[PDB]
Design a protein around this nucleic acid. Sequence first.
DNA 1: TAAAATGTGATCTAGATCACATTTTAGGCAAAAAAGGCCTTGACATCCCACCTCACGTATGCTATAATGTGTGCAGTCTGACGCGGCG
DNA 2: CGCCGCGTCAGACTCGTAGGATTATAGCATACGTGAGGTGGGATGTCAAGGCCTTTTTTGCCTAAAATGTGATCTAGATCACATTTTA
Lengths: 79, 78, 228, 51
Amino acid sequence: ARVTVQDAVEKIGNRFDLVLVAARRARQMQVGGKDPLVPEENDKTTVIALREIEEGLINNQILDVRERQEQQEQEAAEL
Amino acid sequence: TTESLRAATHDVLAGLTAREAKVLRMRFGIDMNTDYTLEEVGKQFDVTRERIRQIEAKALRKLRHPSRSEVLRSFLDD
Amino acid sequence: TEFLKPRLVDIEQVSSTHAKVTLEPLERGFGHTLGNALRRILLSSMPGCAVTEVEIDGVLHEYSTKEGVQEDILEILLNLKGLAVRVQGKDEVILTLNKSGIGPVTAADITHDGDVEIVKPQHVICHLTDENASISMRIKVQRGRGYVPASTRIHSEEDERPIGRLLVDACYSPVERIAYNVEAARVEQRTDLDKLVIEMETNGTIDPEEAIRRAATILAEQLEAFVD
Amino acid sequence: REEAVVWDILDEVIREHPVLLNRAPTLHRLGIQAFEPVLIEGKAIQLHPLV
DNA sequence: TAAAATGTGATCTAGATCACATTTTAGGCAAAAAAGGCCTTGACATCCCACCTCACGTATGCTATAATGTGTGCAGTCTGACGCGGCG
DNA sequence: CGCCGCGTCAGACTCGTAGGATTATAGCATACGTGAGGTGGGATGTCAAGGCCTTTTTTGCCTAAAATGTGATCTAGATCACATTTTA
């Protein structure tokens, strides 16, 4: 996963969407401080992004669902 | 350097009595476009002038105090 | 005198017979020394028992063959070099195997003396295609150290042998492979230090850790006269 | 002052942090590549000969 | 059976008794007064401000024998294609 | 229509090396403003002693009142050389 980014592409299909989705997740993690799913293993957020996307735990759809749900429940909490 | 400095200064200002901090802010033009004076502290707080000088002194004790000084100590070498 | 010594860090072990060893840290100028010298003593001076000679009935020379058999003689002989054997009282034994039927000839079918351990008793030797064909052989195992080929042995051997008794390149030393690698390991101010990473892969008859332990044991046992 | 933790923290940050290499003239896109860093005690870059 | 445990009993010895008067002393409750906190006063010291302030600097004017067409030190000429204006 | 002359326009990329310019041009008089200098003067800022209040430090004081002293009269522990006597 570290040295080669092939299996990740085999999950999604494109380099560009892979780096965009991965960067989105690792910006949820570099700044948002949300937890990982795959273990840490002393790695910068790039690798954990590429792994979580490799094994099928993060996707643009899935990110949309998560941010959607927490946002909507927050809107219920405001009222 | 200026930014981290100034934030640390305000974080020291938070820990004081009210009149202490606000006087020591406006008396030095801090946090404003103003430049207000001992006399004008007289005009606003209450006409007492040089007890403000003694208050300034007491605050300089309250704050210099090397438990707080060391965020400022790097700026000694300025 | 401001020597440094290593601390054995890891023994990564894939199977019982395949083994890895990281080893750090060392002063510069030793990784190649140790790797070379151990590689030598391992691969050319470790004691062990192995197949020296063979004797089969109805069987004359390797270029000939047996009937009702998948192999020629040669593929069998290669299935005999690859043998895990241990003698436990003696320096020599002569096994027997008398087989029939269509049994792909394992080492399990062999009749074992009490002082013999075959670590891979499943080890295949031959194949009897038809059941009607049946064999009787006997196998000299002898204790030596290192590797010595039967070609150089006949070059060595003037004592008459007959047609029927055969000879195989002795794999005494239980190693099948070793290789070492000198990497560079970090001490805080010192990246000029070197580690020694070893892959050993042997037959049965030994755990590799023990083999190395015996090697260095031997070498110190050579050095005691000059530590003096 | 170049203390000890300087180096340990340098190695700490550099890990998983790639870096770009470039030789003139940058004719085609393989004249510029992204490698991983390896720290060494010298003033001269080393390189992977095949590239 | 070796070696440690067990009776002689008269002659003692450092603390407890025991009812009641007198201190003390808390501890804690009321507080006097002094020393901060609050302000003021007088006296000083240092100014900010600006209000001036003269010397030096600066913007401007004529000088009447007479004199009247540059050049002026460079470039070294790259070259192949493409537009456009003459060029028949 | 089809030259011909003239003119316009590009000429690979990242690093390094050095400091660096020059001619001659009138002169003095008038008169005016602005820069660097003084200068009292509001006005600000400082530093040392005094009057309002609360808190703090001494310090009254208030009565429960348990504690600290009086000393002759005892008591229930505590000993030591001899005589066995028991137990592993």
